[PDB]
């Protein structure tokens, strides 16, 4: 289609640090992909990011009970929605499926875990190889799970026993797999 | 440590809107504008929390009225298209006669309009697939996820049509 | 519990 498009985006961000101890709130308005007006709980009032949001900042900050409402958003909005989903979001724990297999270089498939905090470590015989820690990086499956392939570049010689160790906040002890 | 984002948008002249909550990159839920219903990313979520989707439709109503004012402010300057970056992948190691599912991950694009189909052996396959809504980004572009369960002679392509693309982008995955 | 949405404010006209 030839006719042009016009995009308006609004994002209400709640940033948490050490749980609900330190909370920062952002009320951001966007045109196409350019922010033009923003409320920040650290600043305390609406400010114009670009020249395009200057009328909104002037008009919104003058509305009755506006400043009192946005300055209380960290309590009525952010800290509230944090406790609503805390049981199945902040405390969601899904244990990882670890698979070791090469296709020489060994690959430690780590699938279906959550959250993204994780550590993978190879062991030649209990030394923890450093040379050859080729990792494909953490990737997000979009279904509240993560996976990551952790390849090792070594020549498996005779009865050498390689160990893929996995450390995740869902477990109490590291998980190990051998080949 | 954690970030919760309530993302909304409206697009003209296509007249399509969307509303969702993001938790550390994953969607908590979205609101289907057509059925005026709240759709949770995981069916289990709806049994632990609730959200009246009526408030989502009112926000979109305001975003539509705001868009014209902003468009009229900017002397009707359009949005410049940005081509997406697809990446197909599987979520488990591939094994014959053992089921799995492909993932066609569209990344870094705008506006949020895509024509995405699954090509098997050159013929489209629409049976058993699943789609997610547009997901927000820090640079305010968008992401998307498509899924296709299958059983691993068959070649599988992910055809992606976007206005920022001169030709429909093909990404192949065969065993 | 129940989720609360921050309402979208009307732009200056």
């Amino acid at each position: 289609d030839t006719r042009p498009r016009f995009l308006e985006q609004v994002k209400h961000e709640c940033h948490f640090f050490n749980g609900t101890e330190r909370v920062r709130f952002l009320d951001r308005y966007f045109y196409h992909q350019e922010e033009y007006v923003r409320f920040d709980s650290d600043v305390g009032e609406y400010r114009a990011v670009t020249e395009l949001g200057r009328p909104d900042a002037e008009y919104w900050n003058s509305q009755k009970d506006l400043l009192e409402q946005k300055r209380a958003a960290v309590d009525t909005y952010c800290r509230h929605n944090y406790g609503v989903g805390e049981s199945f979001t902040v405390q969601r724990r899904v244990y990882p499926e670890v698979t070791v297999y090469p296709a020489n270089l060994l690959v430690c498939s780590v699938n279906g875990f959550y959250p993204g905090s994780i550590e993978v470590r190879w062991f030649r015989n209990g030394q923890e190889e450093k040379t050859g820690v080729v990792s494909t990086g953490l990737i997000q499956n979009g279904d509240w799970t993560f996976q990551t392939l952790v390849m090792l570049e070594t020549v498996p010689r005779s009865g050498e026993v390689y160990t893929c160790q996995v450390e995740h906040p869902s477990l109490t002890s590291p998980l190990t797999v051998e080949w | 440590e954690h970030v919760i984002i309530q993302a909304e948008f409206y697009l003209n002249p296509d007249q399509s809107g969307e509303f969702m909550f993001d938790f550390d990159g994953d969607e908590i839920f979205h609101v289907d504008m057509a059925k005026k219903e709240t759709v949770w990313r995981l069916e289990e979520f709806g049994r632990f929390a609730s959200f009246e989707a009526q408030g989502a439709l009112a926000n979109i109503a305001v975003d539509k009225a705001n868009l014209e004012i902003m468009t009229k402010r900017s002397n009707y300057t359009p949005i410049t298209n940005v081509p997406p970056e697809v990446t197909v992948l599987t979520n488990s190691p591939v094994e014959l006669r053992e089921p799995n599912v492909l993932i066609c991950f569209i990344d870094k694009f705008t506006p949020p309009v895509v024509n995405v189909t699954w090509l098997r052996n050159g013929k489209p396959v629409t049976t058993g697939v699943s789609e997610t809504v547009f997901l927000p980004r820090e640079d305010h572009l968008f992401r998307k996820f498509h899924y296709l369960p299958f059983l691993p002679e068959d070649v599988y392509d992910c055809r992606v049509e976007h206005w920022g693309l001169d030709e429909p982008l093909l990404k192949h995955w065969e065993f | 519990g129940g989720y609360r949405a921050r309402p979208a404010k009307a732009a200056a006209t």
Partner: T-cell receptor
Amino acid sequence: DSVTQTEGQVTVSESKSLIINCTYSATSIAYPNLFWYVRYPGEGLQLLLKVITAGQKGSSRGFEATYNKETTSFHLQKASVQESDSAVYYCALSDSGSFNKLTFGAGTRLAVCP
Amino acid sequence: AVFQTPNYHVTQVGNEVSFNCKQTLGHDTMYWYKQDSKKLLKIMFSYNNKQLIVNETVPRRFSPQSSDKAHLNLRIKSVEPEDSAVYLCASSLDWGGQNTLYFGAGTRLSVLE
């Protein structure tokens, strides 16, 4: 959704303490907010005080009310009522997880006799 | 403030009446409340940015209208004796339940057979 408060009119001598009972039966309220509205003689409705968090309490004009989610109550108190406090006090209830929609109690009429 | 009109009105059963309200608080959301002969306050309509968001099973008899964010009008075509009440106009910063409602002086309607 219903709100029950002290019925009818209450006559109190000045400098006496006052308690206006109010309980709400949130049966399908995901995020209840509690309100006390007042209408002084010859004027219109205006907010006396409100509480948004389930544990806190709000105060204004010497009045005090504690959002108590355990006994699902929101009683209004004052240690020494003044003759200017004679008015009609309304207990209100809203659901913050929805559009704003106030459910009012029947209202309590206060008469402070000097 | 929140101004509404008229202050008083008396009319026969079956006539038309028009109430008008305006608020100068820059608010996005406005309301109409009915106070029956038993002093029970109950919401009727709620508008947000010229659009209706809350209809508390009000009869089709009632027709609210708003072509501006700061205005909200109410027309009752063919009134009934049950329509005799006090109608309060209110406004809030937005449709969030944690916002204060600012009420007008009210319209006292008397419908007679």
